[PDB]
Design a protein around this ligand. Structure first.
Ligand code: FMN
Length: 116
């Protein structure tokens, strides 16, 4: 199963990605050494809806599941639609340890419906 996913560690500064799957690398055109330690926002760009980024911010603050459709950018500047499901994962004692993200490439909901 081709699974594009990244993991972030929130107990380190600015929630850096600590692991990215090969499907995520092949999708974003970045090398594995070019993503680790960075916040995922670098995929964002001029066309990224800031109102959607704000929702991701609230979901991380409140540590709950969210699903959003975003526009991200590859290393070479290409423009794709990212269907992204964010989800917390906690240790045995109920403390947040990581965030996992699951990506998907394609224009699922048409943009005129997403703008309303
Ligand atoms: C990004 N994937 C992604 C994966 C995880 C596990 C997490 C926690 C976040 C993301 N983001 C969002 C980014 O890291 C950040 O949380 C948001 O931009 C909001 O933060 P700020 O402080 O800037 O408002 C992802 N963002 C993307 O654009 N693409 C992903 O694949």
């Amino acid at each position: 199963m081709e699974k594009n996913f990244v993991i972030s560690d929130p107990r380190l500064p600015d929630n850096p990605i600590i692991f990215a799957s090969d499907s995520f690398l092949e999708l974003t055109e970045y090398s594995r050494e070019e993503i680790l330690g960075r916040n995922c926002r670098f995929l964002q760009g001029p066309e990224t809806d800031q109102a959607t980024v704000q929702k991701i911010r609230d979901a991380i603050r409140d540590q709950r599941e969210i699903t959003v459709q975003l526009i991200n950018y590859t290393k070479s500047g290409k423009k794709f639609w990212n269907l992204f499901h964010l989800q917390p994962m906690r240790d045995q004692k109920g403390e947040l340890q990581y965030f996992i993200g699951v990506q998907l490439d394609g224009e699922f909901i048409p943009n005129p419906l997403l703008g309303l």
